[PDB]
Amino acid sequence: EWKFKISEVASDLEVPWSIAPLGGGRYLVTERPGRLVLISPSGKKLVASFDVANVGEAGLLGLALHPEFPKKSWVYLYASYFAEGGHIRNRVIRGRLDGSTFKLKEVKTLIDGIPGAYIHNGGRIRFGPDGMLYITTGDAADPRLAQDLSSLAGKILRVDEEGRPPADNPFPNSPIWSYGHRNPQGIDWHRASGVMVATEHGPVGHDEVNIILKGGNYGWPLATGKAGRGEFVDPVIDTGSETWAPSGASFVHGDMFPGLRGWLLIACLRGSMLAAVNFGDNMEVRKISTFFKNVFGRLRDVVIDDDGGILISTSNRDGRGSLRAGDDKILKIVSEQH
Ligand SMILES: O=C(O)c1cc(C(=O)O)c2c(n1)C(=O)C(=O)c1cc(C(=O)O)[nH]c1-2
Ligand SMILES: OC[C@H]1O[C@H](O[C@H]2O[C@H](CO)[C@@H](O)[C@H](O)[C@H]2O)[C@H](O)[C@@H](O)[C@@H]1O
Ligand SMILES: OC[C@H]1O[C@H](O[C@H]2O[C@H](CO)[C@@H](O)[C@H](O)[C@H]2O)[C@H](O)[C@@H](O)[C@@H]1O
Ligand SMILES: [Ca+2]
């Protein structure tokens, strides 16, 4: 049996989309309606507000700190907005966070006009081992765009700290890294092998975990789940007729849980659970375990804290689920002797 203690790190957030650990029990969090909050042991502080398209699954979403933070004080956000004609689109922005009087300054757009909708806006952003910013996007309710290399929809993007496609991107002067995605909301890198992983929502069933290769085509909408065809990279997990609704995902690392080292943690929305996936040598699926089924309701993000503790966000305030007192929250999971 797995043994642990869970505390509430913060509460009554509105759809806390993304958590970025600062160390010393401080955290930056986005709330989907358009705000970036600092969480401290002390209390809750509003860093920045944003006028976002706060409708359906759109709003203020991913959050990433520059790999050199706080020395290079750059903070990246992924945000929905109403474009010309009232259509929902998505952008990636960046500001300098003042390490004192925590305030955000010189916010500029890096990437504009990503397609968007009430559904399928992607949204997860994270720096990988190569120092590049990766960005997930959904098919914006328009599945064919996922196969279209002239479109930013249904992709995983990879750009530098400035939003530029690196010369070694797979496609000519293009931010695209991989394609054929429906609605990916989770990415991480295995801390030893550097293998990249991503989650995805499937059409009802067929939620996925994928190993992300440079220039890979993940099949949507020509294929869903394990299709067994040469032209599409298949998922390593395919939930079949079951629905997880996975978003955020992180590989476990650090001192806290040595026996979970290199397992993949996945927050599930409708699944209302934390999935844990054990990868063998050469990234074969050894085991999948399932935690907290229906105790907290909908879960959205999962990240490892500076000490190796597991941070989770709840998402019952999107009202696709029912509320617990003081939802939504950030929960921290530590080992028993802590
Ligand atoms: O089949 C389902 O029941 C189901 C549930 C959910 C959910 O729990 O919100 C999503 C999806 N599907 C889905 O396809 C999807 O792209 C999605 C995005 C989100 C989100 O909250 O950002 N939820 C869901
Ligand atoms: O994204 C690729 C292309 O998609 C559209 O074309 C497809 O859909 C049409 C129906 O709306 C058909 O007429 C067409 O034959 C399909 O290939 C779009 O019209 C194209 O411009 C895109 O390149
Ligand atoms: O045979 C159907 C599968 O084809 C591809 O997988 C093969 O090709 C890859 C590189 O060409 C190999 O790495 C892989 O191990 C082979 O199985 C495709 O990527 C799979 O999704 C298909 O199911
Ligand atoms: Ca797929």
Side-chain angles (χ1 to χ4, degrees), residues 1-2 4 6-99 102 104-280 282-283 285-338:
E1 198 210 28
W2 185 35
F4 52 85
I6 63 208
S7 51
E8 302 183 337
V9 161
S11 64
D12 51 285
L13 294 162
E14 197 173 6
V15 191
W17 219 90
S18 188
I19 312 165
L22 287 160
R26 318 276 203 217
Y27 314 82
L28 284 161
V29 186
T30 53
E31 302 184 78
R32 197 222 256 158
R35 54 191 111 81
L36 209 223
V37 306
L38 175 84
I39 290 162
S40 35
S42 164
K44 195 211 303 321
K45 201 261 192 286
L46 212 202
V47 174
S49 291
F50 300 97
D51 179 18
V52 298
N54 181 37
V55 74
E57 309 165 6
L60 182 68
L61 312 184
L63 162 67
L65 302 177
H66 190 283
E68 253 73 89
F69 196 87
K71 192 186 310 305
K72 199 83 208 251
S73 217
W74 283 333
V75 64
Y76 304 69
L77 308 148
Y78 184 106
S80 299
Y81 66 97
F82 293 115
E84 185 182 328
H87 303 105
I88 295 133
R89 289 190 182 183
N90 290 293
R91 44 170 192 147
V92 174
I93 66 191
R94 190 195 67 185
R96 243 192 189 90
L97 214 220
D98 204 341
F102 272 62
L104 205 51
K105 256 315 287 169
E106 63 203 28
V107 167
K108 61 174 201 179
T109 298
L110 301 185
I111 299 175
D112 226 356
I114 300 162
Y118 268 61
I119 61 165
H120 308 168
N121 296 288
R124 192 72 59 199
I125 73 180
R126 201 170 201 171
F127 283 94
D130 54 9
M132 309 308 300
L133 183 67
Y134 292 71
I135 300 162
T136 71
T137 73
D139 70 2
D142 189 357
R144 64 169 232 263
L145 300 174
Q147 294 292 121
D148 192 324
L149 297 170
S150 74
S151 176
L152 269 15
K155 305 295 190 288
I156 298 182
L157 275 22
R158 185 242 209 185
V159 298
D160 67 19
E161 71 193 359
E162 217 80 50
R164 298 179 290 199
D168 70 336
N169 265 200
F171 304 110
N173 289 110
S174 169
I176 297 168
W177 188 244
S178 70
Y179 64 113
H181 302 292
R182 185 170 175 286
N183 196 28
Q185 290 179 335
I187 44 172
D188 206 10
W189 298 262
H190 183 280
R191 187 161 261 244
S193 48
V195 162
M196 175 170 33
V197 144
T199 64
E200 203 168 305
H201 303 276
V204 172
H206 307 105
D207 300 319
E208 298 187 356
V209 181
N210 290 116
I211 295 172
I212 306 300
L213 285 329
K214 178 168 161 191
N217 180 350
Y218 290 76
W220 177 256
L222 276 13
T224 178
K226 284 169 195 191
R229 291 285 170 89
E231 59 277 27
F232 319 119
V233 183
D234 276 346
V236 92
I237 287 160
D238 162 0
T239 69
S241 68
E242 202 197 325
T243 310
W244 287 12
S247 2
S250 298
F251 283 103
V252 190
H253 74 270
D255 296 332
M256 192 79 70
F257 300 99
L260 280 178
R261 173 141 33 222
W263 285 60
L264 209 223
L265 267 21
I266 308 171
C268 301
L269 295 155
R270 195 208 234 246
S272 297
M273 69 189 186
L274 184 72
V277 173
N278 188 24
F279 290 102
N282 297 330
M283 298 296 299
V285 175
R286 288 284 95 100
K287 230 263 284 292
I288 145 266
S289 301
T290 251
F291 300 110
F292 316 131
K293 185 66 162 200
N294 289 317
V295 313
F296 306 122
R298 305 169 41 82
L299 309 177
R300 185 167 291 278
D301 199 22
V302 205
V303 168
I304 312 314
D305 206 341
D306 71 337
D307 56 19
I310 303 171
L311 306 159
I312 301 166
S313 309
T314 70
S315 165
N316 296 131
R317 287 187 64 196
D318 57 28
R320 306 230 268 227
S322 60
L323 308 204
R324 335 277 129 148
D327 275 342
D328 280 310
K329 24 212 176 228
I330 300 172
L331 308 171
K332 188 174 166 161
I333 308 187
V334 304
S335 67
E336 226 154 17
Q337 72 287 348
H338 181 101

